Design a protein around this ligand. Structure first.
Ligand code: BLA
Ligand code: BLA
Lengths: 482, 482
């Protein structure tokens, strides 16, 4: 339901955060086209007067002095009478956007940055699980930033999330282990955070600073702030932070292999600015964790295939030890079941269902089986909530919540089918998930939920999901039973 | 071990490098037990007059002031009359070793390392090969250190090596593509360089500074300088470097999944000293490269298994369909050879052999078959130098330099054998690999070779090696064939 939450144009809200100043210039003269309403505090003149002027008549010589590395390298530290500032240049809507926010003052920031970086490479990580991997990343972002709480947030396949790891001050409330609606981060935001992987909300109570004029005159809409570091966020989201007790918020996108794996979310009870130089040091940590997780995941899946393939080879040696169909399956029952991590297996080598292990009754097999041939799957069909797909068996989640069947013949319907029983899982949603928002009457005004306390839910009638190794093992068993 | 090369106790040579000072204290009084002979250059008093004195009376006040963080963190910057120094503590032979070394002078050093760390962690690495991954490792290590030439050196299975990548300042000889004998880095060095990942030789012309006494009086041998940043290196190597025309040398160990994969080797035409803190920055880069290589490599091998398994998946459909064995083993011939990257396959499934593709003649295969049935292998056997283990086919490197064989039956001689042809290769050694050293008459003193000029060698009668995927595919195919 592409609803109110997904429709807000969070890049065209036309305001910025108060700790910074934004200028935008057009054309060969670099004439001031747009300017934030608070620019007097740095430029010494009312912003209204500066509109339309050449850039040499607007910026101080300090900033203009560093224009070329600004343009080349994208950012420079300038020292102005007001103090040390970071200047950030990008292009948006055919304008040259210039943003100025307070520079990093801690001289040894990069030295400490390099030290935590060492902690996230080390010899080997994940040494007691990729769990210890996330906990290090959480602890190092928190060491580097000073945020009262830091959490590693992963997306599920339906874009809801759970906090997997957490590093926070003593006496802080936590969120470790809970799940959050997919609508807490709607579709257009995930889209943006796939492009722009950083965001600081320095003070969740502050007023947003408007831009002048409110529309880019040639465009008829406000300036696109997709890449702005000062961009003020959805007012819906500010209300969510305050409903949470949060005063400052800083988050970074974990992009694993081009996709949006999750987030590193940081909370501070009080307003808190983090310099751009230091936000970029944190970005290095998140790219490093994304690298550590790919290499451990790929190593785990290799070890998985190695175990399955040893099983397959032990099955081959068995069959190659005497003309003996239904009996070697009987004699190698665990290996046929562990092939795909199953609890039973129906083998339709044609005649009668040969039922091994923990299986439904014979009739129920054939009925499941008749129904299977009429499906548009090539060599294999798999599911974890069978009963959703076939309620003739919805009451047998004791033995067949999930199934994995490979077609043993092209035409005709010989099958091997592995069965899995349900595993009940309790999950703690952070708030009642049936009511994730609060609409006013008329439904044109949405609000975040008011509560986040654990709202608990047990899931039934779904099995453990069929992993990639289970599928590959199934393909191989089919390879040797033809 | 073989050569006298392997016998040199390079950790007990008894000297340090002249740009630093080493001091070793024993026992609760921190009495001075061992000190380098140049220690007056930083302490005022004659070193021998200091042996047997408490630490409090021998060290300058500047060093003593920093004593507690030095004991805690194990490294510390102190400002001495002779300049800024880095102080390091380690333990060796029941003594507390203190080494002094000139410190880093560029205050923006770590900001520079943090930027190049971004270059190397950057997602979408290797998107023009692991080869472009290595080139970036050389280029950034060269950027961070300023050496005239930085090379990337990979060890082969016999521990000879080749330079896979190279970054060097313009107008300088290179070594890209060349190979170097295993004896160039002898066995005790490879062992030491596994557990000690850095070495700096700052001045290849300099004489070492001796320790006093020449032995630890308790032990009757020199102080173990294994973990010493100032250790003076084997004179045979110092001669090697001078023969190479190198004035300073610095190298780092590439450790990948715990074993010594190779080195990043740095040469300077002139003496040059890298700070400890800058050396530790380069170490960050190498653990990065190691990590980038593991994820890329396990990515490649998983992509490979995927193609093999798709071949296997399509073989299984060809079976379980029309006809006999040899029938389908004739349309799918291209897949059967492809399974293992091979130009031929012989199939012994009962009658005469089934020869598919480019194979040696039926009598030769029958002769090879009977010899295979008497060898200590369980299901698979493979080689890439068939002729040097089976001379009957040494002449047939045109069709059978490599074989890969699987048993399709236990106590029986049922086999699938894949053949490969020779693939000739032109190695360029850095000098004559038959004379990799110039020994003196009576063979008591060795010297490195005099020349490193390109020296060609062609390797015949060897096939392309059998990779994990090849082996994996073969076993899976045996799975299919009862
Ligand atoms: C650990 C748990 C946790 C979650 C799940 C979380 C959600 C979350 N919501 C966000 C933004 C957002 N949330 C919303 C909208 C909504 N949000 C709602 O709950 C409903 C009511 C709507 C809409 C009807 C929008 C539009 C943004 C984008 C803010 C912006 O970039 O403008 C962000 C990015 C901004 C930031 O880092 O603070 C996060 C991390 N924050 C956390 O700490
Ligand atoms: C371009 C490729 C390339 C190679 C292959 C190379 C070899 C090499 N030899 C080394 C050490 C060494 N080499 C030797 C010994 C020998 N060496 C000989 O050729 C024979 C004569 C002996 C002995 C019989 C020893 C003993 C060491 C250990 C040095 C030490 O740490 O004390 C080292 C480590 C120290 C350093 O980085 O300088 C390298 C890199 N250097 C390069 O740049």
């Amino acid at each position: 339901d592409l609803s109110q939450c997904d429709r807000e144009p969070i890049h065209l809200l036309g305001g910025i955060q108060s700790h910074g100043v934004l200028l935008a210039f057009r054309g060969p003269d670099r004439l001031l086209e747009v300017v934030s309403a608070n620019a007097q505090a740095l430029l010494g003149r009312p912003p209204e007067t500066l509109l339309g002027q050449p850039v040499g008549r607007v910026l101080p010589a300090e900033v203009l002095a560093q224009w070329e590395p600004l343009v080349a390298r994208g950012s420079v530290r300038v020292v102005l009478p007001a103090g040390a500032y970071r200047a950030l240049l990008h292009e948006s809507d055919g304008l040259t956007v210039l943003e100025l926010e307070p520079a990093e003052l801690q001289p040894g920031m990069e030295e400490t940055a390099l030290e935590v970086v060492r902690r996230l490479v080390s010899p080997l990580a994940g040494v007691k699980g990729t769990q210890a991997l996330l906990q290090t990343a959480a602890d190092t972002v928190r060491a580097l930033t000073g945020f009262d709480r830091v959490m590693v947030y992963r997306f599920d396949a339906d874009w809801h999330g759970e906090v997997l790891a957490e590093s926070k001050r003593g006496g802080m409330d936590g969120f470790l282990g809970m799940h959050f609606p997919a609508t807490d981060i709607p579709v257009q935001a995930r889209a943006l955070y796939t492009r722009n992987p950083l965001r600081l909300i320095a003070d969740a109570r502050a007023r947003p600073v408007p831009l002048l004029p409110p529309v880019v005159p040639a465009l008829g809409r406000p300036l696109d702030l997709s890449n702005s570091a000062l961009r003020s966020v959805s007012p819906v989201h500010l209300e969510y932070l305050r409903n949470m007790g949060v005063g400052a918020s800083f988050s970074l996108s974990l992009l694993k292999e081009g996709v949006l794996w999750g987030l590193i979310a940081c909370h501070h009870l009080e307003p808190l600015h983090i310099s751009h130089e230091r936000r970029r040091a944190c970005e290095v940590l998140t790219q490093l964790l994304a690298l550590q997780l790919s290499a451990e995941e790929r190593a785990a899946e290799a070890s998985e295939d190695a175990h399955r393939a040893a099983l397959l080879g032990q099955l081959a040696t068995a069959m190659g030890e005497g003309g003996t169909l239904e009996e070697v399956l009987e004699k190698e029952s665990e290996r046929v079941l562990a092939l795909t991590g199953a609890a039973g297996v129906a083998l339709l080598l044609g005649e009668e269902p040969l039922l091994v292990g923990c299986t439904p009754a014979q009739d129920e097999v054939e009925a499941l089986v008749a129904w299977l041939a009429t499906q548009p799957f090539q060599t294999s069909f798999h599911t974890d909530r069978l009963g959703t797909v076939y309620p003739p068996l919805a009451a047998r989640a004791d033995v067949a919540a999930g199934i994995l069947a490979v077609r043993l013949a092209p035409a005709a319907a010989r099958f091997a089918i592995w069965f899995r029983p349900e595993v009940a899982r309790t999950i703690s949603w952070a708030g009642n998930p049936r009511k994730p928002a609060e609409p006013e009457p008329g439904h044109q005004r949405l609000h975040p939920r008011g509560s986040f306390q654990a709202w608990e839910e047990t899931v039934r009638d779904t099995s453990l999901p069929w992993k990639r190794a289970d599928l590959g093992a199934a393909e191989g068993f089919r390879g040797a039973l033809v």
